[PDB]
Ligand binder design. Structure first.
Ligand SMILES: *[C@@H]1O[C@H](CO)[C@@H](O[C@@H]2O[C@H](CO)[C@@H](O[C@@H]3O[C@H](CO[C@H]4O[C@H](CO)[C@@H](O)[C@H](O[C@H]5O[C@H](CO)[C@@H](O)[C@H](O)[C@@H]5O[C@H]5O[C@H](CO)[C@@H](O)[C@H](O)[C@@H]5O)[C@@H]4O)[C@@H](O)[C@H](O[C@H]4O[C@H](CO)[C@@H](O)[C@H](O)[C@@H]4O[C@H]4O[C@H](CO)[C@@H](O)[C@H](O)[C@@H]4O)[C@@H]3O)[C@H](O)[C@H]2NC(C)=O)[C@H](O)[C@H]1NC(C)=O
Ligand SMILES: COc1cc(C(=O)N2C[C@@H]3CN(C(=O)c4ccc5[nH]nnc5c4)C[C@H]3C2)cc2ccccc12
Ligand SMILES: [Ca+2]
Ligand SMILES: [Ca+2]
Ligand code: NA
Ligand code: NA
Ligand SMILES: [Zn+2]
Length: 806
């Protein structure tokens, strides 16, 4: 119930929200069907439009007008945004030359530069270049301020997940808004675009910017706008709030535009109908900047122009139907479109089996345009699994396509020509970032970055302490003139042991054999030097990784590689080695095919054993430092140490062996040497975080050897590739991956072919940030470089995407 008989007189767009049954006058009252009877008359005035004209200048104030051109309007804070241009001979902001804002130039009473977020739905990154001719205001913000060529959204590349990620710094799996449509099985409740459930606070997790600000005593404008409020009125409302007395005035504001997304869905991303929406958004930017200029705030406010995601060409004819795959199509519920999420239609049906559903959906048609995954098998870079609202079965849909349950869903629900939601590395899904103001840099281009990083920066811009989030605070310091956040490196928690030779060969009963008993002070002293770390500077280029949790581990040195060996997990946490451009690949000699060698520095009790692999009929083993890349025949024997062995399914060994034999050398050729750090990852509860020993669900049969869920590699070289990786004077270049350790290659439909036709494709799909590996391992990399810590944080957030030019 709402008693709509109260009044909005003097309460229009009030900031404090009033609770039922008292009638509301705030910018969301329309969405709640709760506005006071006179809200339209008083608060949504439209008389005489949005622009001053010559004849209105110095008019007698008429309170019915949408905005004013009378002499008193400046002091009332309610002139039309072009008032000073029409009536007082001023220029439009867009017409003024760009001049560096070296310091904030703020009116008295302003405690800090205000922040205005200008968010645009479906604004695809390439619109900045492709639409530049029809967006002069936006082009001026972009060229004069700080801009990225694009900003990466979160998966899924849907509206609410991305807007709320912008507001929180969190991945969707953590904030809880995991799609535009959701079912929560604990609440037994459904979230939809239409209706009232979506307003219940239980859906919205984390701590959004407006709450962070309020808790720390920084006032916020309301971020949300009911669709029926015209954009011109939203801008006038923001400008009016900015004229409030100091103690009442918010410091942070958001404007939201439904365009260009609305038209993009109808016309496709580059339909000729798209020019007009782009013009109109630019005009709105112009209105804001003109109004800021009137308030003398155009060189005081920080403005962020940011989109939520892009837009791809998608039409009804490019739809895959599950009814062409599944016999049991009425036993499932599908969330459809540019991603698929499948669950059982009834929880009372015990003939439901996810394994048979996945199998019926796997490589069934030659050009199949989606791929099924159990959620824990999705690329870890999507961070899309750790929430009960994410269904166990997920369909990753190719760009330009939809998935639907049955054909009748698509015609009895072509209308649309655009959609979004696809994998967040897809070029068409990329969106925009521009920052303009005293706190941002002048005429500066920054590399692409992820939208999870912005919350921390917005907190920095407002002097706020961010709530715990998924940005890496300091990684975006290069966007900022001042207010940088200067983080310290985390302290190492566990210090390593440095074991010498402590065990005789006969103490080991591992069931391993090696033809190594074939045999000199010239060469013997030298081998001893290698075991004490004499080649370490070559192979450990950026310091040893720090272990940020409590554990027991040993540093092991060798001619060709160094490792951090876990006595708890019985294998390395990391293995580090450098491969120069000149390095040569060799084979595993015939006599060494099955060679495994006890490591006399490490006790039998903290070693793996070969018998466990002999007896586990599903599990084989691989090596972290590859024997193929040994520096000499004699050095090769180190690669067969039991302390360099890791458990691998035969199907995974196909992938790993090709990476090690073919790709590492290829990367060293192309990049002028590479440094590689490889290791295992254990994430059995798919939370993106390192498992403790008691979370491990699978062991090599009969043994305490844990089976990794994933294997990573971090591949570093010199950004200036005229310098070799091991003698780099400046910035670094990195690419990394987190490969799923799976017992089949069902993910790769072409896997019966030679590895040259499918392995690198798999690896590209599983590209990762160094930071993603940090979370999954509790390790901290790049501890000893010549680079600034902020630069290193940016390097750690880098993702190599393998997409072509934007
Ligand atoms: C991205 O950044 C984020 C934020 O920093 C990281 O997420 C954090 O990770 C922490 C570890 O996973 C986690 O810490 C836990 O907090 C528990 C208390 O949680 C409540 O309070 C916080 C603080 O206000 C709040 O934010 C939480 O909000 C979550 O939950 C509600 C839903 O109920 C949602 O509205 C909201 O979206 C959010 O959900 C997300 O996180 C939860 C986990 O909290 C998931 O379940 C969801 O799927 C979703 O992803 C909560 O309201 C605290 O109870 C935990 O402590 C347990 O475990 C430790 C182990 O050491 C132990 O000491 C305790 O005893 C306790 O164990 C007991 O419970 C167990 C399980 O029931 C049981 O098995 C035991 O036997 C014990 O009885 C824990 O400390 C923190 O909450 C989240 N924060 C957020 C916002 O998500 C995230 O990791 C980052 N991602 C990456 C990849 O780096
Ligand atoms: C918390 O959510 C936030 C909300 C808002 C806000 O007013 N709205 C209201 C709009 C309603 N709406 C759609 O009807 C819609 C739009 C595009 C689509 N494509 N496909 N389906 C789609 C459905 C999108 C909502 C956004 C602003 C924020 C601004 C900053 C941060 C968070 C915001
Ligand atoms: Ca959107
Ligand atoms: Ca985990
Ligand atoms: Na085996
Ligand atoms: Na296959
Ligand atoms: Zn949309």
């Amino acid at each position: 119930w709402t008693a709509t008989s109260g009044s909005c007189k003097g309460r229009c767009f009030e900031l404090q929200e009033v609770g039922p049954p008292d009638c509301r006058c705030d910018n969301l009252c329309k969405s709640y069907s709760s506005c006071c009877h006179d809200f339209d008359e008083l608060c949504l005035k439209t008389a005489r439009g949005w622009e001053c004209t010559k004849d209105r200048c110095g008019e007698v104030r008429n309170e019915e007008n949408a905005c004013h051109c009378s002499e008193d309007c400046l002091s009332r804070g309610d002139c039309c945004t072009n008032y000073q241009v029409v009536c007082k001979g001023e220029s439009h902001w867009v017409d003024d030359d760009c001049e560096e804002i070296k310091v904030p130039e703020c009116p008295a009473g302003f405690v800090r530069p205000p922040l205005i977020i200008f968010s645009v739905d479906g604004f695809r990154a390439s619109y900045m270049k492709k639409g530049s001719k029809v967006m002069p205001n936006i082009e001026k913000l972009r060229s004069c301020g700080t801009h990225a060529p694009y900003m990466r959204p979160v998966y899924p590349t849907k509206t609410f997940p991305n807007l709320y990620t912008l507001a929180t710094g969190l991945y969707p799996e953590s904030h809880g808004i995991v799609g535009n449509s959701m079912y929560d099985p604990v609440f037994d409740a459904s979230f939809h675009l239409r209706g009232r459930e979506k307003f219940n606070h239980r859906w919205w997790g984390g701590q959004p910017l407006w709450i962070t600000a309020t808790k720390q005593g920084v006032r916020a404008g309301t971020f949300f706008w009911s669709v029926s409020i015209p954009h011109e009125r939203r801008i006038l409302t923001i400008l009016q709030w900015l004229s409030l007395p100091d103690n009442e005035r918010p410091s942070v504001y958001a404007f939201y535009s439904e365009q260009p997304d609305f038209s993009g869905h109808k016309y496709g991303p580059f339909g000729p109908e798209m020019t007009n929406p782009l013009r109109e958004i630019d005009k709105t930017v112009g209105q804001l900047m003109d109004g800021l200029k009137q308030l003398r705030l155009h060189r005081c406010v920080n403005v962020i122009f940011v989109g939520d995601h892009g837009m791809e060409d998608v039409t009804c004819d490019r739809t895959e139907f599950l009814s062409n795959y599944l016999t049991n199509v009425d036993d499932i519920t599908l969330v459809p479109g540019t991603l698929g999420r499948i669950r059982a239609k009834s929880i009372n049906n015990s003939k439901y089996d996810p394994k048979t559903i996945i199998a019926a959906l796997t490589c069934k048609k030659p050009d199949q345009h989606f791929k099924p995954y159990m959620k824990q098998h999705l690329p870890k870079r999507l961070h899309y699994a750790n929430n009960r609202r994410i269904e166990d079965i997920h369909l990753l849909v190719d760009r330009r396509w939809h998935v639907a349950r049955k054909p009748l869903d698509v015609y009895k629900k072509c209308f649309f020509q655009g959609d979004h939601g696809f994998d967040n590395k897809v070029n068409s899904m990329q969106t925009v970032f521009v920052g303009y103001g005293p706190t941002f840099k002048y005429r500066t281009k920054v590399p692409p970055f992820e939208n999870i990083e912005l919350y921390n920066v917005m907190c920095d811009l407002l002097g706020l302490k961010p709530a715990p989030n998924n940005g890496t605070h300091g990684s975006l310091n290069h966007l900022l003139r001042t207010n940088t956040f200067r983080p310290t490196m985390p302290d190492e928690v566990s210090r390593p042991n440095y074991p010498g030779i402590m065990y005789l060969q006969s103490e080991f009963d591992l069931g391993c054999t090696c033809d190594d008993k074939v045999e000199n002070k010239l060469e013997e002293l030298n081998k001893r030097l290698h075991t004490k770390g004499s080649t370490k500077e070559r192979h450990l280029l950026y310091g040893r990784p720090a272990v940020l949790y409590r554990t027991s581990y040993d540093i092991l040195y060798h001619t060709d590689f160094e490792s951090g060996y876990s006595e708890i997990f019985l294998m390395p946490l990391w293995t580090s080695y450098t491969i120069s451009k000149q390095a040569e690949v060799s084979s595993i000699p015939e006599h060494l095919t099955n060679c495994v060698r006890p490591d006399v520095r490490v006790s039998p009790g903290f070693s793996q054993n070969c018998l466990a692999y002999k007896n586990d009929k599903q599990m084989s083993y691989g090596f972290l430092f590859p024997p193929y890349l040994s520096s000499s025949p004699e050095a090769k024997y180190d690669a067969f140490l039991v302390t360099n062995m890791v458990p691998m399914y035969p199907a995974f060994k196909r992938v790993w062996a090709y990476f090690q034999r073919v790709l590492v050398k290829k990367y060293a050729s192309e990049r002028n040497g590479v440094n590689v750090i490889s290791g295992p990852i254990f994430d059995y509860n798919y939370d993106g975080l390192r498992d403790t020993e008691d979370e491990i669900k699978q062991y090599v049969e009969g043994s305490s050897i844990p089976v990794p869920t994933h294997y990573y590699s971090i591949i570093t070289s010199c950004l200036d590739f005229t310098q070799p990786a091991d003698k780099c004077d400046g910035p670094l270049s990195v690419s990394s991956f987190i490969l799923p350790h799976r017992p089949d290659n069902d993910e790769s439909c072409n896997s019966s072919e030679d590895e040259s036709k499918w392995v690198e494709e798999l690896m590209k799909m599983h590209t990762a940030r160094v930071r993603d590996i940090e979370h999954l391992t509790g390790l901290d990399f790049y501890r000893k470089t010549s680079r600034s810590y902020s630069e290193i944080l940016t390097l750690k957030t880098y993702l190599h995407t393998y997409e072509s030019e934007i």
